[PDB]
Design a protein around this ligand. Structure first.
Ligand SMILES: [Zn+2]
Lengths: 114, 91, 69, 239, 52
RNA sequence: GGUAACGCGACCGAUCCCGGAGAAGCCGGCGGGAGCCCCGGGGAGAGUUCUCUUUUCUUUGUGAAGGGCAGGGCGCCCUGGAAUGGGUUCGCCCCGAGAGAGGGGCCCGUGCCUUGGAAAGCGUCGCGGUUCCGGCGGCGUCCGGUGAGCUCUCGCUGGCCCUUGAAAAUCCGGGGGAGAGGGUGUAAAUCUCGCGCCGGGCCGUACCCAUAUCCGCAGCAGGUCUCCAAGGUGAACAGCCUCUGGCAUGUUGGAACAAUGUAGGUAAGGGAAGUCGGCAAGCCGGAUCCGUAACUUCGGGAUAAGGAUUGGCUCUAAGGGCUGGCAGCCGACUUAGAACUGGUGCGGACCAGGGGAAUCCGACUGUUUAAUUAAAACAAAGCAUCGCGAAGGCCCGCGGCGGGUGUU
RNA sequence: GUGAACAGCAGUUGAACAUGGGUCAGUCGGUCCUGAGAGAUGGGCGAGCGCCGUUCCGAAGGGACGGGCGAUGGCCUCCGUU
């Protein structure tokens, strides 16, 4: 039975203290520090709770060390908004633009009559 | 099989806090535990988040409704009064 | 540490300027060449003894060669 | 008590819901904003909602906090101004609306950005208008009719969260957490059980009052405890 | 400072310093640990100054 | 490059604007992966060996850093359109706003081995230096499937709130095109890809963490903030016996065994008849099976009140995965039944309910006079009214459009 | 090393006495920031040491992308330049 002791001065059950168990080459068991892992970045839409894939869910201080394609994906609005909401905004853009064209035609007809 | 005779969701409380008080509270408790049908989709997905707010599972659209119930009779009369004032303004 | 797969990359690594010291680990059925660069310790595992004996002569003379026991 | 103990504890409740700043766009125009999301704010019983506007001169994404009305949804265009149409969730001046309109978040004076009648399930009712010199009689939920100078603006509809005090309190375990969230004055102690050296109604061996509970309005501090200038008492007969 | 010990040794004795590790005694004195390069031996530089 | 999730190696770009991590409550259930345990065979050390014993115990691998393969989650995009209603959980939910059938694809991979890495370390046997020596030589550093066993981590899902569960520094992500670069090559600018070179100031690092190092006038039975936690018995982090570790009885030793003290038990027969006072003390005790009244806010009563059983040895029956209606191979625990038999013996030591009927008060959980009263005291679920529309209700103040209520 | 006093007798021993050693960091925590809260200061009050307040009646950005003009270090070429 590995009756372990402390190594640092922090004695209490602190939530910052996150360790894991691993076997040493010297055939004894001691803790190793787990790196702090964050969540995946959520899209800027808000209506879709599905987080984006292809991005390492990690502490965002690693993003200064990561490369450019590792940070953002090669897609329009990369790593900011999902392509479903992008094409929904494009459909809304085209439909409201054609509606404004119809309103312009009706305004031209209103100026033609009165 | 038959669980209880006449008591319902207040039956987990038991002998405490009287009979008529629990009988009065039961009508509000069943009305808040029974989910309502949405207007956009129509599916019974309106989950009670907190007071004056309702969350939908299918549409994912927050609807600010009543405290305990979804639509009150007072809100129906307010909507009818707004309809009447709109028709009176339109003439 | 990293592993060099081909003989040509190992020769281009051994002919560098910052090559400190190579060592030879002679275990059974394998000859491990370990070259000490600045960042990694680059290793070459050769299972053929005749190819390893040819490569040991193919080492350049301007390098600290040591056979580890 | 004077302070630092009986005060309401406000830590997670951030900010307050204020009415939009007046300008020419609220004087003789209108403008459209969107509803972002509604959320139950801590402390206040009624939930709040984010209403996003834009500045006509600048280019920052503005936001405004309003009281959430009953029967409203997120992702909706809200117009606001004098020339706006009549619908649910629309702030507009009182001189444009007709009489008999259920409004809330009303101003007692033009400029204070909304004070009267904006709690959980409350609305003030406009009785009648006056075209000359801009006067308006508005009945408050107490019953009194106040005269308002008709320069203010108010939204349309009742406040969401109506009928919260109809059900009695279930248990003291819920009551302890509720009053711990609200304000630390819940263990209400009887003044007879209190000591006579601090509370005036204390003292004596038996549990008796022995003095009239009615008190004059002209009274200093320490004595002024009880029914303050009670005209009548007991069961309310009729109105 | 740890660099000031290195400059003070390099100006006087003219010898290179690898690293400097210092502590403070409970009696109230700083105790340094000057690592030397292997080209100049510590026993030899002690025999040069005279101490043993 | 691909219809696509996305990937490869660097693959521009200001002011300003937007979004994310930061940065979030509690509980119940399920699944996967590790660590510690369990077993068969094979190895190195010892004990038992009047008798048997293929017996008993110690032990048997790998870090950080890069990559691949398992294995999970998929609310990720296509071929196609489903009611005689389908896939599906321990539980459920979803579905012409797109189910089952099919192909790809990213996220985490701590499990596998490869570079690190056997060189080191652990033993056994021998060779020296009488010694100073990361000394010297041979061998091992294993072969496998499992388990509601205990612990840790991750994932899925639901419930609870009249309570909605924190702020600040920091970073990159996205539109955006005013500018910097040039005439056909050794082009210019641009480099978040692999590299190469130099440094990262100052403060503290010893010991205890408790019936001898903290506080209590002191080697003071008191108080005393946290981590790690073997085998059997057993539902149990309950109680008892053993493994590792620690210990030599806590301001003293020897001798006989008076009365009266302190802590325990045993006591023929009656069993609260003594005493304000079954006060103290004593009995019942667990599990299985049968079975249960008065009154009732129908929820409780209730374990109501009550009864039968409690060993050893040796059998029978019932419930599963893999491969090719069908046969073989691996199998982990529970339940039911029968005879023989032990001096009626069995929850053989530990754990271990007193009920039934009445009267008064208070519903009750809860706070409580540190140190004579824990209760019918208080908090209290419900009800009843008083004042007040910010030119004011209340409180504080010596003062300043004073502060609190009022973020109302 | 010692045997003046203590360890309720006892002691060669001990946290007893005297001489000496013993704590080494680019990678460990503080250092950076804010929370509850405190507080300088505009302003005002107060005979008075001083008091109210944290935006409250205020002449509140001492920072910076680019263009022009004189000048310097390296052939003022290009950058820290002014
Ligand atoms: Zn809907």
């Amino acid at each position: 039975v590995q009756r372990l002791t402390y190594r640092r001065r922090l004695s209490y059950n602190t939530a910052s203290n996150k360790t894991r168990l691993s076997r040493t080459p010297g055939n004894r068991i001691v803790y190793l520090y787990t790196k702090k892992v964050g969540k995946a970045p959520k899209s800027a839409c808000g209506v879709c709770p599905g987080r984006l894939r292809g991005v390492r869910a990690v502490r965002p201080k690693v993003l200064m060390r990561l490369s450019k394609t590792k940070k953002h994906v090669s897609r329009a609005y990369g790593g900011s908004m999902c392509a479903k909401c992008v094409r929904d905004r494009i459909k809304r853009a085209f439909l409201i633009e054609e509606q404004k064209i119809v309103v312009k035609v009706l305004k031209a007809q209103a100026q033609s009559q009165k | 099989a038959k669980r209880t005779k006449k008591v319902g969701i207040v039956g987990k409380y038991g002998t405490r806090y009287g009979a008529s008080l629990r009988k009065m509270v039961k009508k509000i408790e069943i009305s808040q535990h029974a989910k309502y049908t949405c207007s956009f989709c129509g599916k019974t997905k309106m989950k009670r988040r907190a007071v004056g707010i309702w969350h939908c599972g299918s549409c994912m659209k927050t609807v600010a409704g009543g405290a305990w119930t979804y639509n009150t009779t007072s809100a129906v009369t307010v909507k009818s009064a707004i309809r009447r004032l709109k028709e009176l303004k339109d003439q | 540490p990293r592993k060099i797969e081909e003989i040509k990359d190992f020769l281009l690594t051994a002919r560098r300027k910052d090559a400190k010291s190579v060592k030879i680990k002679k275990n059974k059925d394998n000859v491990k060449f370990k070259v000490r660069c600045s960042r990694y310790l680059y290793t070459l595992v050769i299972t053929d003894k005749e190819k390893a004996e040819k490569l040991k002569q193919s080492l350049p003379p301007g390098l600290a060669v040591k056979e580890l026991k | 008590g004077a302070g630092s103990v009986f005060r309401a504890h406000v830590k997670h409740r951030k900010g307050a819901a204020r009415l939009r700043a007046v300008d020419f766009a609220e004087r003789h125009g209108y403008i459209k904003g969107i509803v972002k999301d509604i959320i139950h704010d801590p402390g206040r019983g009624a939930p709040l909602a984010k209403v996003v506007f834009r500045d006509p001169y600048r280019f920052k994404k503005r936001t405004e906090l309003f009281i959430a009305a009953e029967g409203i949804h997120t992702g909706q265009f809200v117009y606001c101004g004098k020339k706006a149409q009549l619908n649910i969730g629309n702030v507009l001046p009182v001189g444009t609306m007709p009489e008999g309109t259920i409004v809330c978040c009303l101003e007692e004076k033009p400029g204070d950005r909304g004070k009267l009648a904006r709690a959980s399930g409350n609305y003030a009712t406009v009785i009648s208008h006056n075209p000359e010199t801009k006067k308006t009689r508005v009945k408050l939920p107490s019953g009194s009719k106040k005269v308002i100078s008709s320069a203010n603006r108010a939204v349309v509809g009742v406040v969401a969260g109506g009928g919260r005090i109809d059900k009695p309190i279930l248990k003291a375990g819920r009551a302890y957490h509720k009053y711990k969230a609200k304000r630390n004055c819940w263990p209400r102690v009887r003044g007879v059980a209190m000591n006579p050296v601090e509370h005036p109604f204390g003292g004596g061996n038996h549990q008796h009052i022995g003095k009239p509970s009615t008190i004059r309005r002209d009274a200093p501090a320490g004595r002024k405890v009880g029914l303050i200038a009670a005209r009548r008492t007991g069961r309310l007969r009729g109105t | 400072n740890k660099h000031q010990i290195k400059q003070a040794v390099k100006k006087l004795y003219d010898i290179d310093v690898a690293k400097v590790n210092t502590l403070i005694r409970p009696d109230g004195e700083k105790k340094a640990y000057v690592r030397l390069a292997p080209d100049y031996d510590a026993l030899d530089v002690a025999n040069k100054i005279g101490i043993i």
